[PDB]
């Protein structure tokens, strides 16, 4: 399948070269997979989600996304126009308040929630969790991410936006999950992207168009935007049967575009997520 005039990041993940604008992908499109977006919530009523998104958990007075961040990330995972895996099921877990903030205890609870809640959902092709959040190093936060991964969920986490080594941030620094840095449309490391040996992969993160609250759209930047590209890619590849939750990060690294990004610090992988779709 081909989506013309796609957001640049979708085109990038199906291309061996920057500078194109059509997204190519197998029509299965992540059908039968599930992606949890652990964030500020999801505006599930947005026409872009087509009834495939729902809130399953909140730790606050509402499950609604009063911020937009979680809706944007969910849109990059699986919205019809802005999403990588256009037929996946999206589940929202609101661990961040409408200012985008959350306590680590709540974030940990949300990860353990997903590890159990997947057993209440129909995801025959597999389960992914997208965590566009983080803060300073916490062994307890890393352990929660490791549990979620161990339970059979492909965990993708943002590297962080400090232009610093991600070893000092959580859950970015957890070795067993997929830590995602950000790139721009010219294949440069995004100016804010964290780096370091703990990164597994880069995805599009600068000037990413996606869904927003109020039934709208907007373009924003962050490793928060790169992470759902990788989460959606994992769901798509799992639906194709090419990989599993336990192996998808490694598979994405195996099949990435290699050596094509600029300003990658020595010691950080030079790997850009790629769906290897041959039309």
Curated annotation (Swiss-Prot):
GO terms for molecular function: metal ion binding; serine-type endopeptidase activity. The active site is at 39 (charge relay system), 69 (charge relay system), 224 (charge relay system). Its EC number is 3.4.21.64. Residues 7-279 form the Peptidase S8 domain. Its cofactor is Ca(2+). One of its GO terms (biological process) is proteolysis. Ca(2+) 2 binds at residues 16, 260. Binds 2 calcium ions per subunit. Disulfide bonds join 34-123, 178-249. Belongs to the peptidase S8 family. Hydrolyzes keratin at aromatic and hydrophobic residues. This is Proteinase K. It comes from Parengyodontium album. The chain holds residues 106 to 384 of 384 of the full protein.
